[PDB]
Amino acid sequence: RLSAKKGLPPGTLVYTGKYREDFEIEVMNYSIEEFREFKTTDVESVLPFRDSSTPTWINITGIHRTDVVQRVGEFFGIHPLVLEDILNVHQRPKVEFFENYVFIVLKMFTYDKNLHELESEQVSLILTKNCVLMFQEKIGDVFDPVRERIRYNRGIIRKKRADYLLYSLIDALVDDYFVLLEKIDDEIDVLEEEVLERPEKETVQRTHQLKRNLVELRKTIWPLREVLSSLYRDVPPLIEKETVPYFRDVYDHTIQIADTVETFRDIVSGLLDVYLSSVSNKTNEVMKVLTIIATIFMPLTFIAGIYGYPVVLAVMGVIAVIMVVYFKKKK
Amino acid sequence: RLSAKKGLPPGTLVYTGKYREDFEIEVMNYSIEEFREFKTTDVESVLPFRDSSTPTWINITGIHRTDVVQRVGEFFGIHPLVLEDILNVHQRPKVEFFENYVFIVLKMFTYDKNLHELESEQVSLILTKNCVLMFQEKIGDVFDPVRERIRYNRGIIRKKRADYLLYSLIDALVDDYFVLLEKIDDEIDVLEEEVLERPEKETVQRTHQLKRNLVELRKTIWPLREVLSSLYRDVPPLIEKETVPYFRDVYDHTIQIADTVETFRDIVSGLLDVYLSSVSNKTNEVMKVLTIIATIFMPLTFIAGIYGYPVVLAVMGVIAVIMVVYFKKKK
Amino acid sequence: RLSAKKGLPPGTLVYTGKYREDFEIEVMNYSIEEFREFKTTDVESVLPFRDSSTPTWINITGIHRTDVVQRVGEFFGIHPLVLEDILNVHQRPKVEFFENYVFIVLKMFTYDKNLHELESEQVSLILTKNCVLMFQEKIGDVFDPVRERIRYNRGIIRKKRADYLLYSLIDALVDDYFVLLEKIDDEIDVLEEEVLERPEKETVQRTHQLKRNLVELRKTIWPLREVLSSLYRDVPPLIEKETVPYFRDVYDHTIQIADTVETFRDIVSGLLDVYLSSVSNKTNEVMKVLTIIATIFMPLTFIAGIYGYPVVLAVMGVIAVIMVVYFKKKK
Amino acid sequence: LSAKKGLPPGTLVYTGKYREDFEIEVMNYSIEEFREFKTTDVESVLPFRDSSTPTWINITGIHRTDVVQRVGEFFGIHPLVLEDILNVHQRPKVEFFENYVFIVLKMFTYDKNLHELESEQVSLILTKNCVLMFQEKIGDVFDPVRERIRYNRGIIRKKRADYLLYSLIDALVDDYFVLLEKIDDEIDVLEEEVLERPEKETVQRTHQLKRNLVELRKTIWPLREVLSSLYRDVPPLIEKETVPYFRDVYDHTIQIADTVETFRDIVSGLLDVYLSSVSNKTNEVMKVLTIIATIFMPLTFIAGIYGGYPVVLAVMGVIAVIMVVYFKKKK
Amino acid sequence: RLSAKKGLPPGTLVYTGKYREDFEIEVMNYSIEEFREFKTTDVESVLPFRDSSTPTWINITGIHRTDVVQRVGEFFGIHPLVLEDILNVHQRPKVEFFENYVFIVLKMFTYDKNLHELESEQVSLILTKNCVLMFQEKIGDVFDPVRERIRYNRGIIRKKRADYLLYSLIDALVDDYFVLLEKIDDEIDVLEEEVLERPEKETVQRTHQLKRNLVELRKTIWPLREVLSSLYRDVPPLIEKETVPYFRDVYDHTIQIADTVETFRDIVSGLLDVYLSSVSNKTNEVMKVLTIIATIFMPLTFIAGIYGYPVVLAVMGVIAVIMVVYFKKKK
Ligand SMILES: [Cl-]
Ligand SMILES: [Cl-]
Ligand SMILES: [Cl-]
Ligand SMILES: [Cl-]
Ligand SMILES: [Mg+2]
Ligand SMILES: [Mg+2]
Ligand SMILES: [Mg+2]
Ligand SMILES: [Mg+2]
Ligand SMILES: [Mg+2]
Ligand SMILES: [Mg+2]
Ligand SMILES: [Mg+2]
Ligand SMILES: [Mg+2]
Ligand SMILES: [Mg+2]
Ligand SMILES: [Mg+2]
Ligand SMILES: [Mg+2]
């Protein structure tokens, strides 16, 4: 549903999401020499991989299938509290370190331009033995470049173990926030136009909309930085002075992303005061126009009114040009 | 608000609340095999349970009955300073660890929609031997799902000891803040309508009212996070590498709740500036309308006035349509 | 008053106060069995008490008598730097722990309602041997309930030693901040009326006045929290696992008072923006009234003016009622 | 001027603005006797380096970089320190070297009525039995300290050179109280003009004061850190001797910081108070326009339809007093 | 030119910059005795210098030449992750310490006055053995004074080793921020003119522009302080109690720069509210002018209108001077 699933016992596997469309399993098992890869929708087929001596990346898509999550969960010996965190998708990103596995929760965003609105999808990962278990809400992810790298043997991914695969997955995900930040920079640039130039009713709507989107963004990003901070200065089954430099590089991007997001909160928050000033000033002009038209034709209509002749007209042009050369000392 | 109860000695048991309606004791004593449960209003009947070898949940409702709190207090060996903390309900949530008992104070909120106003109830808990003493201000709580779990033997609560009962009750209370958060989100959504759309006198009232409610909400939630932080990374008679994972899960929700509350403070604080801009932009129109009507009929009334003929009327139509085709360059 | 007392040597006893009215000494010496109490204005009479084996509370009122403070100071062996801190009354509250005495400086406030203005008095205390030396600026304090408790043997104060007397004195003073907070809450409640309802010139005065008063209040309360924090987690001649729980209870109120004060800063800071919005929105009405009256009687006065007949009056009523049934589509 | 770029680390440039005067001034003293003189020949003060009795060498006019160099080398002061002496745009600070303490402070001047504040840097070096002092321009706050050595007041003559350093820092810190007093006056004057004399130059002074307060805070906060460091640290500062004295300056330092925060806070609101005073006058100016408008608009119209007589005047007084008794329902 | 370079393996050397114009290498190898210096565009010629026993400063300009960076990188044994950080030009400044080298990334700014806009260039440094490798985007730097010092044997740079050269290069770069800060102080001084004096549409543009520039500036300066904080209290191959005092001096400038940047954020952020008030008040005055002209010539045009004689004119002068001596009680 949404943020209530109340009075249920601790271990209860409920998908609180909204995507119940697809379901797919996808394995990739690889070594320095060779690699295999397949999709199935039968779970019992991927369970043997728990015991590979070679890296495997099991990617379960469509976790609305709580049955499936439970089965994989029990088989790999994952705590029910963890499985529950997998299936509840309104949640702090986070990392927890257990005996024989690392658990990570991350968000993966989408921004629709022009209908200025942003959705997220939760991704969970579990490193354990030679496996990276991945859990997703819906088909469509940012991990495609990583598949190619295993498939077409690019980079060093094939030489390296399962922890480096975790790295590689996290790095693909963090990098995507750069795409997202670029799109948001464009809305900001568009919006600081309308503000001091197209003053309007729907212009104020979009400002607030962006501010709101930024707050949501900040809410994910700051714990995301903490995730990567934790992965970097910590380290159990992450082959150490080996992969640690790589986590640190993602940690760095994380810090960059956080900084850029603060920068936007900052720029945007002033934006309304810029609009307020653009409009109060458009008021000032309307006022001046009213006031000069008023200030000449008020006495002129008065002296023409005291009745009850080209010397009246002449006084009417004298006190009319001493107005206009007084609104040459302001206006 | 009874925020004063001054010049009384440290040990003094005064209920500073406002609920003096009901009174009830309710025991639930349980084990893996069987369970018993009853209500009474005679205190002497519950005191034997102090020495159970099996988990017990004594729940005393209506702590306006200071005499009752004193008796239970003294019998379980609870410090007078703690008993006074129980009866005084204007207070930081908190945890205090003593020799043979943990003491906890929490708040439990109620939001009345439409009459946009929020009340709270304090709940105190004392874990000690195999007991969870609970103290409440008035009938009606969030612990109902927990009773069913003991009654109908759901979950694992019956296999686990008194500390897990503590957990289970806190967990039930923390979860309720999610209900409350959802209701507040709705007011926020409703309010960012009226602000940029139904500009009004009572609209500004509700904004402030919400802001106020948010501040009160923040005041409780932040120390609440600290309560659950303390329970998690600490631990005396809380069967350790057993129940600790559970408190941690509540700790997490606490962090989520905190985060969500900052997000509302943030969104709402801007809401007045959104209103300001919605209104400064409106005034502008009333001004333009006044100014065009002014600016044509000011000189037209003047030249018609300098007379005190269809060539006058013709000049009056020429300088009237050169106005209207100049407010086609703005307005 | 006052505030500079420059280029004087370190040890210099100047009263920088403003109260030079009264002077009084008042002793209360007590034990489990019996108690004595008296007032004097002769100092040499109180000095023997330094060597009681029983708790004594010497209360010197009117420290403008720097001579007296010096005498008592030297006799109990109190550092001249401390005596100077006693007599200088613009000053962070604080605690300083010396060899054979604790020194404490606190403020004690008065809020005059209706003439919305707040004064304070400084109170100093020195625990040393079996004495609590108290120093005050002017007659009238909050310690009256404490006298009663010694006099009429209430509570446990008579069983306990001098440190518990210090506690009692501090506890009485902190509790008075509750009184003061309640009075401030009332001004806030009254002020958030005038803001969105009686918009006015003197209304803005009171807001600022209150904000100012709150800043002054925050300035004292935050270091007050630090005083009590320090007394609680520290402890020399404070009979330990005895009186510590009691300091801890004051510590708790201190935190509550701090929290409440932040809450007011928060609430009040928005209050001007509420007024701004209440006025920017009214201006609107005054504008519309001007604009309707303007917009009908501008052209009506023009056509009646083109003349220098019940078909003129009929056109004047037709275009007058097509206005009013157009301000039935707004206004 | 704070550019002096691409010069090697050791470069002695005076980046100040005061090149007027130059003077040396020694005061050497002991418990028994004291000598003091002025010179402008440096070689005369260098012998003092080896006193067994406290000396206070005060060099005024450090635009004389040659002099600073000579004293520097002779006392064995690192060129990096010497450069910090001559560069006057700089965080106040304390640096502890092998055989000396180095301290940099600011010393302010506020000119009332031309609401503007200048500073002068003071450096100090404690080393052996010397306190070297370096100033930009004649005129300092140290006069009371000279008298105390001259006229053997206080205890300065009994105590060593570290107590002299204290005495000098204490004199300088105290001066900030003078400066804070003067600033409190501007604040009190300004919160008049804001809600009472609304004006163009009123807004100027607000900003000006805000700016002054930011510069002030910039110096005061590191100043607190200087004194914090001197207090809880201590090498050649005769310990449980002079430590109490540094601590007392430390306290003033904290009081000064707290008072400055109080002003930042008070003043920051001050513009919103002005905004509200004006948006409201707007309201009044509006009402006045609107009543005058609303009666004399129709009255000028009916007198205009011609083209009756004390029956028109009577209708003109009726619809004129039904206005005024309608602006008895608002206004 | 973006910040997306997505789905590429960790080690990938892409120049994400925008300057592809020049390319140059420039070595300076020096010792106490003598020095050599040359430019080349052939890389293989500089590689031998890796093994100098004497300090060398290799400065590669035009890192768009990724091939060159790769070659120097591998030969000096620099990790591909660092190389990638060299070529990626959008990036937290930072320091990373590896086995046999220190890596540092810094920015180097340019402010164009009058077209109020600021660009930056990245500079990377690697201290390794007796080399400082420097990497730049485009010809033109701040390091010229440092070349002179080696060339014309000034300062102590020739006596000192490679770590002092690093210091010298970082010190040159940090110093330039003072130039940049001076230029920005000028815009602020100019802008707080236009705000309270030349109120205008393009005046608000520049304010925002400057705020934006400040935020970007702050983004670089803060991690910059962290860079130099890290170099100072850390230290591997930086000859310790030797060069550390020097890094500390840069550290200090860094702190100063940060403090100055906060000061500007602070000053500038209020600048819009100053403009708002300067304009709302130009509203207030325009209003008063309209309202006095209105308020006299409204009734005067009415009584001259009631028809249908020097006693009419006399009443018209009486009620015209009782207005003007009523706008001597306000206005
Ligand atoms: Cl790779
Ligand atoms: Cl359960
Ligand atoms: Cl008591
Ligand atoms: Cl050098
Ligand atoms: Mg749950
Ligand atoms: Mg009490
Ligand atoms: Mg969980
Ligand atoms: Mg605002
Ligand atoms: Mg003093
Ligand atoms: Mg308590
Ligand atoms: Mg330098
Ligand atoms: Mg320096
Ligand atoms: Mg003191
Ligand atoms: Mg990459
Ligand atoms: Mg990188």
Short mmCIF file of N, CA, C and O and ligand atoms in Angstrom, two decimals, chain A residues 81 84-85 94, chain B residues 249 252-253, ligand 7:
data_model
loop_
_atom_site.label_atom_id
_atom_site.label_comp_id
_atom_site.label_asym_id
_atom_site.label_seq_id
_atom_site.Cartn_x
_atom_site.Cartn_y
_atom_site.Cartn_z
N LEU A 81 14.30 -10.26 9.25
CA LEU A 81 14.32 -8.81 9.35
C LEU A 81 14.86 -8.19 8.08
O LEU A 81 14.32 -7.22 7.59
N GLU A 84 12.42 -8.61 5.15
CA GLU A 84 11.36 -7.65 5.28
C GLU A 84 11.78 -6.27 4.74
O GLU A 84 11.05 -5.66 4.01
N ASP A 85 12.98 -5.79 5.12
CA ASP A 85 13.57 -4.55 4.57
C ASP A 85 13.65 -4.60 3.03
O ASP A 85 13.40 -3.61 2.35
N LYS A 94 20.71 2.23 3.32
CA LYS A 94 21.46 1.79 4.48
C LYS A 94 22.33 0.60 4.16
O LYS A 94 22.18 -0.01 3.13
N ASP B 249 15.66 -2.46 14.50
CA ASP B 249 14.69 -2.29 13.43
C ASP B 249 13.76 -1.14 13.78
O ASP B 249 13.34 -0.36 12.90
N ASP B 252 15.76 2.08 13.27
CA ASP B 252 15.60 2.45 11.87
C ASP B 252 14.31 3.20 11.63
O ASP B 252 14.37 4.29 11.09
N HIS B 253 13.13 2.66 12.01
CA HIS B 253 11.86 3.42 11.77
C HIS B 253 11.89 4.82 12.42
O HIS B 253 11.32 5.78 11.92
MG MG F 7 13.56 -3.06 9.22
#
